[PDB]
């Protein structure tokens, strides 16, 4: 038997579901057909309405304490929770229901992990990360907006192979993917180390691939696999394509000032 995955969606943009299907190693097709049993997922599932909701109860009963709950997005606490309605009820009630009998809970992306864009000031819906709502279950955070496809499938692969959550850092992120800052192995580091920086877009320095620190790069304070694993089968990452890291895997990155404002105290990161 393949482990059931119940994939819930709260307040979200669906970037995590989209990133997931970009995985090359393994293919998302192979994950779905051969590794997990993706039994509930509003983006891909055939059933709708009453037929879709009936699946949750069936899987929860037959695989009690032996299914994975994956959550994309998050629940709002304002508007009596009805700024995210599922089956005529607040999303938070669905989340709590499905979480109670899950073996493990994955918080996909910055929304589920930390609050995401909807939680940026002034947070009109009081969007709240999953771990602040579900406080009695093991949760792995896989942050990033979205996370890298191979990081997402890498987490699933580990959990299915070993029937274990991988080792987590103090913020609940898997050390196998989030142990390095972007800046640790960024290929532009030799320029940073020499004080060679882009100062204006498309200046001579930009055409030579100089460091993006002075254009606001948040790589020095951001933990992710982007500089090594990279994106879309190792094709590029934000910095390689010329834009600074905006810090998208970090808690509260939306309210850390302008993306183009440089970090202060440059000698910290040398």
């Amino acid at each position: 038997p393949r482990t059931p995955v119940l994939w819930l969606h709260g307040l979200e943009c669906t970037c995590c579901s989209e990133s997931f299907i970009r995985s090359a190693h393994p293919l998302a097709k192979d994950v779905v057909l051969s590794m997990i049993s993706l039994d509930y997922d509003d983006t891909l599932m055939a059933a709708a309405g009453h037929q879709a909701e009936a699946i949750l109860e069936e899987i929860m009963t037959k695989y009690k304490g032996n299914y994975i709950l994956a959550v994309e997005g998050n629940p709002p606490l304002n508007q009596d929770g009805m700024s995210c309605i599922i089956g005529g009820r607040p999303f938070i009630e669905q989340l709590k229901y499905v979480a109670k009998d899950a073996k493990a809970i994955i918080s996909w992306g910055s929304c589920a992990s930390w609050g995401g864009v909807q939680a940026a000031k002034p947070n009109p819906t009081q969007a709240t990360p999953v771990h602040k709502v579900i406080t009695d279950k093991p949760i792995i955070k896989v942050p990033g907006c979205p996370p890298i496809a191979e990081v997402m499938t890498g987490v699933i692969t580990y959990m299915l192979t070993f029937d274990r959550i991988p080792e987590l850092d103090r913020q609940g992120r898997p050390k196998m993917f989030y142990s390095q800052r972007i800046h640790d192995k960024c290929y532009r580091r030799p320029h940073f180390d020499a004080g060679q920086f882009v100062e204006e877009w498309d200046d001579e320095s930009a055409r030579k691939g100089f460091c993006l620190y002075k254009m606001g790069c948040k790589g020095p304070t951001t933990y992710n696999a982007c500089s090594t694993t990279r994106w879309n089968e190792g094709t590029s990452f934000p910095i390689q394509s010329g834009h600074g890291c905006i810090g998208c895997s970090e808690d509260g990155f939306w309210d850390k000032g302008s993306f183009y404002d440089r970090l202060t105290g440059i000698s910290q990161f040398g």
Partner: protein, 599 residues
């Protein structure tokens, strides 16, 4: 109760059916209908069931940062909001971007169109037309024969190939863990395809799932990642150097992009367009021409893809507005005109000072007001039956000069056809695609499959769920063709010595006017997208988005006029009112993006 609007006779006295959640869409939607004594839909209710408040969140922030916030409105139509945002800011500040930035943005936009359209059809829409369990009964040899008739050039056509795919499906189903196919509506009489067509389609579903990840590598090259590639006010960040391996863009990277574009062109021509033509033909033969809704009367797009930058007369998908089904008269659409695009909240969960009027987005207001009407069945936190006489959705109600409009690829193709008939030469290719498609659907495919030839006109075929699905596929093909040309123009311009990718003259807010307003529009995959910004002393004073699914999924306005989703469901028979097959097929033809619609 019962009332008439826009040629539709709405009646809520029949049996009430609820679909919540509507699945195989982006985001969250609830749909309710009433059906008459013969299971025909006589009332339809579109409810957007999510809100995040991006418009509120943007207040006070730096206009240069806005694109990254609004990009996160949606990870499916990823980048179209970023494009709208940078265009709106550039418009506000009178910034003209260099040619290479224009072409790179166009290539990214057209890549999104293709990826979004193809994934929508196969992974979200196809299961409304295709019975996966019927595919298990198919003869692999007859499936091979069908494939060679439907698309002679597609190399993956052997009986053995289809047998292998069938056997993997068989083993998956026989496991007892059906996953995405669990509790499906398989075996419904609403499904009309023969087993061989079902197996062909499921095979392409699997091919498309593997291939779609390659196409987006174009975004990754120019924008660092997909989903959510990076954009920039004033140009693009992906600076150019040929002589160079440490520039974001060099000749090797451009050659890589071209290789991906060529793959896209083959998929659209050999897989996607032929499947839609074949499936469309077979459902046409079954008489399933429902779902026209507002497409039969009122359609709108802002117009997009000028073959000369900043020259709107050269739009390759020329826009405007059509009213009352009169395709001989296209009205110009001006997003700056306060009397044209306006949003009502009469039946939405927001509040205005006066909800009898619609606000142009430069004057737009987003104050939430979640309240349910007196005729609601259930409670505030446990809705059994929503009250559409009151406020029933997180989606605002956009109208054009007070008229309810359908937006999307179908709207753009009707507009292109109208423009082409009036002598517009920039719309020649879409007209050609449409004429080719009608001949395929009416004559060529039936003749190949031994079915009767039909004589439907484009005016008859297009305003339908089949037509809406067709237009999406044709648009995907057209976008692939256009970005192929854009690539050649980009490389030619660079080789001529112009390597510029960003105009930074007004990057610093010390250079800005102390107040300004701007608008950016985009032909997003699902229709007409606009962002309207007001800037004051370097900060965002107002930021309002009106998004394609805001138009299509809109609830009723102050006058009680219905939007495109609600109109499209009207007068459609259901085989079984407890199985929403026909509801899903038609709603899915709009490719609803609910996170987009509400933002």
């Amino acid at each position: 109760s019962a009332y008439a609007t826009q040629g539709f006779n709405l009646d809520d006295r029949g049996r009430r059916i609820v679909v919540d959640p509507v699945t195989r869409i982006e985001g969250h939607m609830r749909c309710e209908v009433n059906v008459d004594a013969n299971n025909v839909i006589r009332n339809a209710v579109s409810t957007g069931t999510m809100w995040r408040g991006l418009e509120v969140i943007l207040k006070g922030r730096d206009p240069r940062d806005a694109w990254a916030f609004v990009e996160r409105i949606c990870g499916v139509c990823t980048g179209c909001h970023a494009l709208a945002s940078v265009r709106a800011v550039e418009n506000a500040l009178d910034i003209r971007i260099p040619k290479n930035a224009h072409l790179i943005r166009e290539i990214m936009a057209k890549t999104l169109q293709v990826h979004d359209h193809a994934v929508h059809f196969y992974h979200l829409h196809a299961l409304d037309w295709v019975d996966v369990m019927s595919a298990l009964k198919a003869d692999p040899k007859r499936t091979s024969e069908l494939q060679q008739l439907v698309s002679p050039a597609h190399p993956l056509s052997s009986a053995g190939y289809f047998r292998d795919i069938q056997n993997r499906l068989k083993r998956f189903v026989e496991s007892g863990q059906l996953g995405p196919f669990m509790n499906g509506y398989w075996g419904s009489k609403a499904y009309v395809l023969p087993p061989e067509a079902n197996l062909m389609a499921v095979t392409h579903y699997l091919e498309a799932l593997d291939l779609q990840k390659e196409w987006v590598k174009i975004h990754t090259i120019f924008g660092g990642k997909n989903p959510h590639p990076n954009y920039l006010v004033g140009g693009v960040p992906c600076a150019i150097n040929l002589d160079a391996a440490s520039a974001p863009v060099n000749m090797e990277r451009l050659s890589f992009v071209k290789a991906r574009i060529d793959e896209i062109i083959e998929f659209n021509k050999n897989v996607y367009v032929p499947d839609v033509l074949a499936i469309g033909t077979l459902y046409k033969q079954a008489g399933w021409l429902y779902g026209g809704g507002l497409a039969a009367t009122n359609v709108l797009d802002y117009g997009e893809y000028p073959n000369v930058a900043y020259n709107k007369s050269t739009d390759q998908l020329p826009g405007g507005a059509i009213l009352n089904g009169n395709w001989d008269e296209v009205f110009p659409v001006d997003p700056r005109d306060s009397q044209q695009v306006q949003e009502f909240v009469s039946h939405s969960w927001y509040k205005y000072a006066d909800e009898s009027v619609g606000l142009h987005p430069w004057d737009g207001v987003t104050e939430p007001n979640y309240v349910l009407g007196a005729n609601t069945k259930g409670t505030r936190t446990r809705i059994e039956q929503i009250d559409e006489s009151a406020k029933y959705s997180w989606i605002k109600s956009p109208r054009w000069r007070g008229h309810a409009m359908e937006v999307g690829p179908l709207s753009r193709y009707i507009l292109a056809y109208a423009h082409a008939r009036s002598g517009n030469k920039y719309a020649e290719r879409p007209k050609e695609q449409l004429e080719y498609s009608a001949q395929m659907i009416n004559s060529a495919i039936p003749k190949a499959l031994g079915l009767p030839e039909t004589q439907y006109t484009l005016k008859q075929l297009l305003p339908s769920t089949i037509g809406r699905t067709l237009a999406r596929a044709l648009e995907s093909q057209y976008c692939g063709e256009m970005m192929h040309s854009d690539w050649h123009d980009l490389v030619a311009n660079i080789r001529a010595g112009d390597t510029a990718t960003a105009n930074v003259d007004k990057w610093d807010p010390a250079t800005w006017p102390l107040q300004a307003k701007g608008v950016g529009t985009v032909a997003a995959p699902r229709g007409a997208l606009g962002h309207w910004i007001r800037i004051k002393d370097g900060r965002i004073e107002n930021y309002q988005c009106v998004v394609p699914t805001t138009w299509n999924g809109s609830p009723r306005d102050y006058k009680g006029q219905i939007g495109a989703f609600e109109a499209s469901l009207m007068n459609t028979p259901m085989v079984n009112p407890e199985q929403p097959v026909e509801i899903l097929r038609t709603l899915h033809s709009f490719d609803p993006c609910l996170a987009c619609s509400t933002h």
